[PDB]
Amino acid sequence: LLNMRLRNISLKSEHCILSSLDFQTSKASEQLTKKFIYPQEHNSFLKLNFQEISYKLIDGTSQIELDPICPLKVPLTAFSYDSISATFKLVLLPKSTQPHRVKITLAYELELHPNLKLPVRTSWETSLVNSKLSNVKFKFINSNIKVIKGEKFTMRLQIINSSSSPLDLVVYYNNTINPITLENQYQLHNKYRKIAEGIILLSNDYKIPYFADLRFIGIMSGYYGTLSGLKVLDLNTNELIEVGNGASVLI
Amino acid sequence: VQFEDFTSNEYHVEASHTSRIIVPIKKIDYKKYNFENTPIPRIFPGRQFIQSGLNEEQT
Amino acid sequence: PSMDIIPLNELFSSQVENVDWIEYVMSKIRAESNLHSRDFILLLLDFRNSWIDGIKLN
Numbered sequence: 405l406l407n408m409r410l411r412n413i414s415l416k417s418e419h420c421i422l423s424s425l426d427f428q429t430s431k432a433s434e435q436l437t438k439k440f441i442y443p444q445e446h447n448s449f450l451k452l453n454f455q456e457i458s459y460k461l462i463d464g465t466s467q468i469e470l471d472p473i474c475p476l477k478v479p480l481t482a483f484s485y486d487s488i489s490a491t492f493k494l495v496l497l498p499k500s501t502q503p504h505r506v507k508i509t510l511a512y513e514l515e516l517h518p519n520l521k522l523p524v525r526t527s528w529e530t531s532l533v534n535s536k537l538s539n540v541k542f543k544f545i546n547s548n549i550k551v552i553k554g555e556k557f558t559m560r561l562q563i564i565n566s567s568s569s570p571l572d573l574v575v576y577y578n579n580t581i582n583p584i585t586l587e588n589q590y591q592l593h594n595k596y597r598k599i600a601e602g603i604i605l606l607s608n609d610y611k612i613p614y615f616a617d618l619r620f621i622g623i624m625s626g627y628y629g630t631l632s633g634l635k636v637l638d639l640n641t642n643e644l645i646e647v648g649n650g651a652s653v654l655i
Numbered sequence: 656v657q658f659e660d661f662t663s664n665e666y667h668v669e670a671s672h673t674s675r676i677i678v679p680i681k682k683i684d685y686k687k688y689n690f691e692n693t694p695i696p697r698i699f700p701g702r703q704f705i706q707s708g709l710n711e712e713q714t
Numbered sequence: 715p716s717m718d719i720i721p722l723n724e725l726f727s728s729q730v731e732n733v734d735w736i737e738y739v740m741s742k743i744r745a746e747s748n749l750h751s752r753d754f755i756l757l758l759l760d761f762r763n764s765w766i767d768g769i770k771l772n
Binding site: 553554579601604608623 | 716718720722723724729733736756
Binding site: 667669 | 768
């Protein structure tokens with residue numbers, strides 16, 4: 405009851421799990437000792453944090469937070485350090501320790517020493533594109549990695565089949581503006597114009613019969629997230645499924 | 656195609672075709688060499704059916 | 715056996731100026747200093763070979 409602490413954990417699925425604890429000043433405790441401090445002629449507190457440490461709770465383990473920290477002391481404030489976890493596959497809720505050491509202060513003496521440790525479980529918990537018919541999974545072998553400079557480049561759509569008639573389908577890009585609150589008309593028009601006119605796909609109806617190369621050229625700039633347009637089409641009626649994947653800044 | 660000193664030109668096989676690359680080689684002199692020794696096996700463990708079913712001239 | 719036509723918007727840069735059409739449009743726009751782009755549209759022909767050897771295709 406001097407410094408309220410909370411830990412927030414965010415699940416970055418393309419990397420490690422990120423969890424950050426957060427100290428604060430706990431105002432419902434500050435006016436308490438503010439009353440006696442301004443009784444003794446002091447305006448704000450001088451609590452000194454001298455040893456702050458998060459340890460990985462286990463039989464025994466410890467971690468290290470993902471940037472640098474000094475030995476600090478603040479009056480009415482909040483601080484928050486971040487430490488990276490390891491992104492679990494399924495069903496193992498890890499736990500942490502989070503010890504701390506607040507050192508209070510008085511007139512060059514009477515440093516009433518305090519310490520605190522709140523151990524709890526660090527599990528807040530709130531690119532394969534499947535075919536959705538017969539598990540013909542597609543993945544780009546270098547997705548989201550392309551700094552092109554309006555030059556040619558090549559990608560790799562590694563199709564993974566049932567190995568049962570593995571020669572079936574054809575890619576294409578569809579350079580055509582799709583035909584679609586008036587600025588909601590205009591934002592959709594600018595999105596559909598920059599999609600259907602910015603890159604070209606130099607191997608158009610490539611008719612793949614399990615890698616591909618798919619050379620593009622890319623004649624306008626801007627971050628093309630999710631790279632729409634690049635559809636495939638297969639032996640059945642309409643397997644017009646997307647890739648929905650891969651991105652390229654072009655500057 | 657690289658031989659021990661012969662290096663060929665740059666051909667072009669397109670999709671399913673054959674292209675006969677012609678390589679020179681000299682003959683191999685019989686009196687300078689020996690060609691009547693048994694080719695060795697890798698192992699020295701197994702008996703390998705040591706009664707080998709072969710004659711002289713077939714070997 | 716298809717056809718498509720696509721406009722042009724980026725002026726481009728000198729270090730990539732080695733493929734034929736961008737050095738053509740840049741070289742054409744070194745003079746005539748009123749046009750920059752949006753007037754040099756770009757048509758996409760797609761040659762297909764129904765034969766049994768390579769061809770060189772100017």
